[PDB]
């Protein structure tokens, strides 16, 4: 059984892997909140989704991408000229090999740092094992 | 087999459980459109997702949270200074026990009341049984 | 095994089926990038999700709906008075019969044409077989 769901506890900005550290579900401990990475243990087909809230009242654009190893597999942007809250969100279905790392990367701009309110999230689960 | 998908038929505002009453899928009848609640029947791991459209032309912020019993498990905001339509959406993976109730709560602001167009939605399914 | 994920390679506008032609996953080849349609091969219960990015700097509203055959099953709008990027996104769980076609239709407005960056996406997988 492989599934996880975590939220962002702190605010972040710039270009970095987002460490979702408010962990709600983590079957098999394949998601690591100290790195923000899900590491594949079984070859197969996996679903992932993310929702990253842009900071409000400070900035107009924010990008958040889902990556596999060093490669973008989905991109998203939040943008609002009046500096309103808005989301960069996307979903994927990927084939993974053992060792592959899946994570969300901030690619410019500012992310809201909810404490335990889980505004910004990352989840995933295996659909098929090879 | 446990899975459901429903849309909002009427417009709502304030602080209340959203009753998605345009039911498209409801395997096992574990979602109740008269309460807006999914009730767990089997201990296990469940995926849920929601997309709630803020009313356009009347208001600037709207919040919608996914709850388990009396506890927030995901939060979302829609915000636009020019009163444009925008979405409060999120997704989760949760462990549930029989009797647990999962639902979307409006937490301030105004939600669009599509009739049968299914702009605002709530869906879920079991991933694993314990 | 039935699952797929694809992104939009080109920009589109108006009223047309969106052809997600940047195919990442397509188990069983049930998604056709030349038509934009997923065709059901097995009766059962299926999850789909989509995220369509509105073009920035040219227009204020865009609609994108998920359809089954000739019927809307989910609707979404992106809207921003300052012509900012924003998303029309939704998710569904549907019962399908063999031959049923599921696709995303642009229903007015302008969609961003990312090349291989996968800003705009469509994915799905079977949950249950009848």
From Swiss-Prot, chains A, B, C:
Its main location: secreted. It is found in: Secreted. Residues 1-130 form the C1q domain. Highly expressed in brain and white adipose tissue. In gonadal fat pad, expressed at lower levels in adipocytes than in the stromal vascular fraction (VSP), which contains preadipocytes, fibroblasts, endothelial cells and occasional immune cells. Expression exhibits sexually dimorphism, with higher levels in females than in males (at protein level). Tends to be up-regulated in adipose tissue from obese males, but not females. Expressed in glial cells. GO terms for biological process: neurotransmitter receptor localization to postsynaptic specialization membrane; postsynaptic density assembly; regulation of synapse organization. The keyword Signal applies. Induction: In adipocytes, up-regulated by rosiglitazone, an insulin-sensitizing drug. One of its GO terms (cellular component) is synaptic cleft. Keywords: Collagen, Secreted, Signal. The keyword Secreted applies. One of its GO terms (molecular function) is identical protein binding. May regulate the number of excitatory synapses that are formed on hippocampus neurons. Has no effect on inhibitory synapses. Plays a role in glucose homeostasis. Via AMPK signaling pathway, stimulates glucose uptake in adipocytes, myotubes and hepatocytes and enhances insulin-stimulated glucose uptake. In a hepatoma cell line, reduces the expression of gluconeogenic enzymes G6PC1 and PCK1 and hence decreases de novo glucose production. Forms homooligomers. Interacts with ADGRB3. Forms heterooligomers with C1QL2 and C1QL4, when proteins are coexpressed; this interaction does not occur after secretion. This is Complement C1q-like protein 3. It comes from Mus musculus. The lineage of its organism: Eukaryota, Metazoa, Chordata, Craniata, Vertebrata.
């Amino acid at each position: 059984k492989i599934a996880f769901y975590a939220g962002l506890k702190r605010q972040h900005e710039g270009y970095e892997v987002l460490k979702f550290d408010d962990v709600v579900t983590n079957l098999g401990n394949h998601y690591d909140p100290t790195t923000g990475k899900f590491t594949c243990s079984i070859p197969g087909i996996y679903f992932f989704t993310y929702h990253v809230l842009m900071r409000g009242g400070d900035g107009t654009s924010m990008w958040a991408d889902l990556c596999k190893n060093n490669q973008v597999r989905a991109s998203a942007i939040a943008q609002d000229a009046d500096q309103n809250y808005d989301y960069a969100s996307n979903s994927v279905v990927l084939h993974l090999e053992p060792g592959d790392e899946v994570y969300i990367k901030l690619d410019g701009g500012k992310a809201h740092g909810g404490n335990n309110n889980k505004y910004s999230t990352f989840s995933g689960f295996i659909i098929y094992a090879d």
